[PDB]
Design a protein around this ligand. Sequence first.
Ligand code: GTA
Ligand code: MG
Ligand code: MG
Lengths: 146, 724, 729
Amino acid sequence: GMEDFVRQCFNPMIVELAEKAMKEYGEDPKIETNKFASICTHLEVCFMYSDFHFIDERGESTIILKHRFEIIEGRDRTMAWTVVNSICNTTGVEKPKFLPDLYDYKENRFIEIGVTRREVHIYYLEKANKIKSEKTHIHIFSFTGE
Amino acid sequence: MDVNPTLLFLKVPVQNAISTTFPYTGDPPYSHGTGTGYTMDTVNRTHKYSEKGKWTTNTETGAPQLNPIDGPLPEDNEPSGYAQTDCVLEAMAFLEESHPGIFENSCLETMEIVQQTRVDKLTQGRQTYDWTLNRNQPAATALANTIEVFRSNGLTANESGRLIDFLKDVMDSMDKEEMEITTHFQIGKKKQRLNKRSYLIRALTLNTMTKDAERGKLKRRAIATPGMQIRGFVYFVEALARSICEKLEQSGLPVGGNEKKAKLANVVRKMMTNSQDTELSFTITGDNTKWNENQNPRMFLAMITYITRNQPEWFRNVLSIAPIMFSNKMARLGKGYMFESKSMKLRTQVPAEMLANIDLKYFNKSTREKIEKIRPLLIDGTASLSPGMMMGMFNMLSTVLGVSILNLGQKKYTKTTYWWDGLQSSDDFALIVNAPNHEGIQAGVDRFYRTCKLVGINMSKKKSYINRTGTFEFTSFFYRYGFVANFSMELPSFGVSGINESADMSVGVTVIKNNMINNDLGPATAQMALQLFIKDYRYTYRCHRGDTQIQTRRAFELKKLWEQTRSKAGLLVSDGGPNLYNIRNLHIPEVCLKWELMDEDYQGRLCNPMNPFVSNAVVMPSMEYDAVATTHSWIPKRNRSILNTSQRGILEDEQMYQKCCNLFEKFFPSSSYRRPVGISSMVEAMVSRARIDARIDFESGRIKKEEFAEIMKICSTIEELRRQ
Amino acid sequence: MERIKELRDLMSQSRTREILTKTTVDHMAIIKKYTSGRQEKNPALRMKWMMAMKYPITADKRIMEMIPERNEQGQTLWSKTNDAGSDRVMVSPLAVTWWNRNGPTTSTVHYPKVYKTYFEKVERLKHGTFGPVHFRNQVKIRRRVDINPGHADLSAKEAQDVIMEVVFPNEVGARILTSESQLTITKEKKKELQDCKIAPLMVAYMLERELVRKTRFLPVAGGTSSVYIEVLHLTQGTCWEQMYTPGGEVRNDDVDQSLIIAARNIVRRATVSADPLASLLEMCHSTQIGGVRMVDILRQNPTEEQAVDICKAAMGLRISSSFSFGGFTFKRTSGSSVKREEEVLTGNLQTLKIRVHEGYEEFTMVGRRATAILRKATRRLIQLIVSGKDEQSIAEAIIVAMVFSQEDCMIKAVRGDLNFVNRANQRLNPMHQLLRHFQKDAKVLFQNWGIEPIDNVMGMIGILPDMTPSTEMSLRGVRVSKMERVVVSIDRFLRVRDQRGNVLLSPEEVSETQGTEKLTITYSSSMMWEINGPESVLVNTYQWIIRNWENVKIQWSQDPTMLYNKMEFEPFQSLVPKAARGQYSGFVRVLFQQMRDVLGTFDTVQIIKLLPFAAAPPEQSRMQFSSLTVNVRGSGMRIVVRGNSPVFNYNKATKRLTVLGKDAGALMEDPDEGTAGVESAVLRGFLILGKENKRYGPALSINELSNLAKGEKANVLIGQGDVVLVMKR
RNA sequence: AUCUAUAAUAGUUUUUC
RNA sequence: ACCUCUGAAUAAACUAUU
RNA sequence: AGUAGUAACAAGAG
Ligand SMILES: *O[C@H]1[C@@H](O)[C@H](n2cnc3c(N)ncnc32)O[C@@H]1COP(=O)(O)OP(=O)(O)OP(=O)(O)OC[C@H]1O[C@@H](n2c[n+](C)c3c(=O)[nH]c(N)nc32)[C@H](O)[C@@H]1O
Ligand SMILES: [Mg+2]
Ligand SMILES: [Mg+2]
């Protein structure tokens, strides 16, 4: 019954993006419902992170033009890697070994967003060991407000 | 004196003049009418080879199915399909015991292949039996129709792009109560709604036809075209069989050409060296009688089950689907027959779908007997064919079975003073038997024959012979202490291939060079072959020399081009120039061979990218046998027979497909070089690429803010149009 | 802007919008191959049929404005009829040949750049040098040769990734170039193709022609490099060889490989001569490698190899007593070895023979990124002291040292489907296979090697199986540290001694592998096959016996000693196993002597078959031989003393002698041939009288004939499944 | 020393009474 | 009857070329 | 009639 709640609560765009992301790797949203909810929450967090942000003519952060963040989540691996490669080539930023979630133009770095049901620190250490990069920024949320 | 060419073999050994025995200068035999007679003969013969088996009625299709597995052991030397399942499992077990880890490693490689293969693998091939039209279609067209039908029926797991997801969609379609399709007629579209059993019969159906242009056969034979539902499963099973065969020394597949000859020679010499000097050695030039009409899909399922032991369940299921579908297969009968009335001087086509309940007075005696024998099997316009592998399918799994039977011939298994080994390629084999005396040789041959009978393999006695080891024949390769040259096999390749002028010139010279390297084509004969090819090339393309008066429609233009040229040697043969090829420069493209002899303006016109015949730039249109594209790389016309049919909307559809594909290539330059991958739609991918590129161009200052805003506005308009 | 406007146009139309929305990128390939069906079955017949049509050729609709409808003679050049499934129009070949004489002319100056490979072929043929044509007994062998060399230190996939990086930087996906070769080539081609004005697809195809290796199996004689393969039709035939040298610049690695092959062949052949040094010198002065004299190459080639160094020392050149193994230059500071073949069982349950070096030895390892000192005994690593640069360099050095040590732990550490034969069932070098296997994944090797506590000597660090610098326990016998030619004298028997007097090299140290040359090796002497491969050596030896059968027969009848000492048999004797040369020679000489004393038992074929084995110094033993072994590509191929054999089969119907499947010539029947079925050159001390004779009990074996005495007739199972009556003189 | 790129096209091989 | 259209793509493995 | 050979062509479709 998780899928019914996921479709009822999350808005249709995020649901479609999560369904596409799961189908890309053969997963069925009807069967894998916990993963469905996880991906929907991850996409919702990333889109809340990105939206309502712009860059002025000077080049500093502003809140309401070009958006401050380039969204890499919610795309198939081909387009996501196209965006990552193009940004790295045009900006000189180091190319990550794994697909990040956002690119921040102001800080000129990649951001790896994480939403965790466990405590923040263990998941943060897991992601830090996984990527093996000191440049890819990591930002971890939690359902408990940590 | 009466001339007897055959007497040449009295002095020249037959293997050294084996080219004389291939009459490949005349036209090959063809099939003129229907293939229904041959298909019915094949079905009747396949069921006759298994007639003592158990009869059942399929609960899902209603088709009568004959099961010869574990049937009575034969008492004679007639062909039979009564393979014993325990014997096949024991052969697999001993093959695994002689090569530890072969099945495990093959399964690992095949698991990787299964997980990584994309759906567009199915487009590789000429024709696929389209169940939505009950006839053959181009593989890409059949796949597109199947995907469209599945999408209209809510079967969209193939959108991932993986082949295994397409197979999941096929399995899900098998459970749909009703499958809907679309039909055209004299040109409107009509919806047809199949039921569960009708769709199931269509999905298990293989098309049949006759084989045209086959050498060395007096009588014609039937061939099969697999449908869209089974192709992926057969591909995965054959991938596993290929992984197994690559690890087997006796396998004749999948190695071809000089590599195959070297492998076979090394294996034969290793067998000779391992043989003791104090024992006899005999080799059997062996064929099998009706290998594919006696092998059973149930035994292939058993082999796959033994091979995939201790594997994940999904892998076993995806490998097992193909034998299961093949043991429930139906065969299309074909075109039918034509009836001629002599008195009323009329002829008419009788469809094969009416043979179920047609009066038998029209047919002759033999056809009437065929129809009487096959009528119980007929269902829904097809024939139930449970036993047998139809035609040219599962060749490498057959090779695996044959190699297991060969492997059963080690002394640890024979447990006597004789032993055997040899080569296996699908159904053809060669066998080497060692024994202290002739009695042991006879005993070993008998044991091999009886073991093959046990696993359902019938050695063709009338097409096999045995002699002292040192000469044999295997897969049309003639071995006389080593493989001999056979020029007649490659003789039909010489000539104008029929691509275009440049490609045909390249093919001619490359064929001459390759036959010099491989088939012992001597230098003098190579020069004469070059002369003959040039003559045929000039006659075919109306491109004789400018300084000749051969009256053709093209002769005036070539005369004009010849007159105005200053350096005649620089002109291509396609333009009426001379032939500069000899033995030393057979490997060099013609345009490059005489590049420095060309006039500047003639060369500029010939290699002009702005010419209408080929789609600082260079001429580009798939440039096989065409190193440098010129105006001679044109494309001939397509067949226009489809304009008289109801499928003439496919032309407009493919025109729009090409338009969309070229527009997409305008956004992803590497798409033509390497095939793009992705689950997103074409418009979505193009819009995302346009947005990221516009942002980067603005950031690097290549475009100004106004153009960026215009691109963003057009992208927003496209997004709005996308939903509506 | 144009792209987005065209896309907006397509999204406005209903059908194109449906295609663009419902088709994913994966299905774009399917719709790209989508067609109504090109009914092409016999393209040759179809082309012959279409060339009789008025307009068999399609062209773009711009031809109606670029080419007139009719020429001067009024012949029509194009029609307004459209091709099926397209907007292209139907045109005549007259339109193409009209364009080639009246069309607009562009600048074709970039064509040699875009198609550099084909014009490179043209230049190589243009500046090539042709030598004489020699009619010989060619022996071609099916081997993997390269037809497109591509780049040396690249594979097809690595080359493709490099091409994608160079041409399509934003389409590379997730690939990151790791190999230093890839980074170097990528930078070089990016700089070279900077500000290039060619279409990116064409640039990618150029880089594919330049960088992508392609190898195929072909029946090849002579050099196997690309420059020789492309002219293989010209240079090699069934009965002739055309001397030819390509006109371009020759790669130096090919020169090194061919020099190694030639030096090994020359040294192995010279070892069996009476004076090895003089034979080696006269062979090195008569040898050419790719149109270049061998002596000049030796004077200007820094190649570390045993046979190459022996050849250098024979000519007074300074040598470096070194060799290569797994990308490192080894040098034996002290110790000695004797090779010995030992059969071992691999970790993945494979049985193979490995050349095991006995004795205790010490070495120094030098590599482009690491350096080590190695001490070892027979299949046992005493200690290894690596002083590499980074973690991966030290890991590679440790792996190479472990494989070199021939440790049984290393053998048992093999996992997976590691094959030790070629895809064409050609035996591979076991050490190379072990190196390539453990250089892919060496976790199991390090796990099974063991561990050992360190005593903290000089501060040299330890190493753990997961490549960490421990200070308490390390890999067994492995320690981690931190970061010249010599005048020699060569003996008459090719024994190289340093100035002090210690032995540095010897013929026994020369590898027994029989490889093939990248560049054609031309040898100019009486026997052009004297340093050829084993198959050519055997075929040409027996053909030499056949051609010279008259005087050879006379000498065999009168003065056998000089016949056995012919220089022509020495290339053959280089194939007989060293330990068995004397035994075979003595056995064959006794057979010949019995054949002379028993008149009428004169089998010509027997003498021809057994003569080359009598060229060695005889050793007298009572052992009987039913077959004599000859090393051909690593496998001992037997020649059966009685009856035909895989190496040697004589056909009585054709009177034609075939060796290894190659015709060697036709014999002529002698008047003194024995047309009585009596054989005297099959058993060392027994004369074959006739067929089976049941009077003398059961048949026995050849290896149990010592108990028999003078005149004791018996039945022996000599040969392939035959029993005959033999008697003792 | 190793050495199945990918793809397209053509060609070759693969029979009961 | 005029008129109009049209001249016909098995499977697998391999080889060659791009 | 002829081609041809286990079934066709000796024009087909609109
Ligand atoms: O392509 C072949 C050869 O030409 C090429 N090669 C050889 N040398 C060079 C150099 N110097 N530069 C570039 N290329 C070179 O490498 C290929 C060698 O193939 P193959 O002939 O089959 O191998 P080889 O017979 O040389 O044996 P290999 O395994 O490579 O070992 C080489 C060398 O090492 C000696 N060796 C091994 N072991 C374990 C030894 C030992 O324990 N003790 C001593 N004293 N020597 C040992 C081998 O016997 C050879 O001498
Ligand atoms: Mg992510
Ligand atoms: Mg056969």
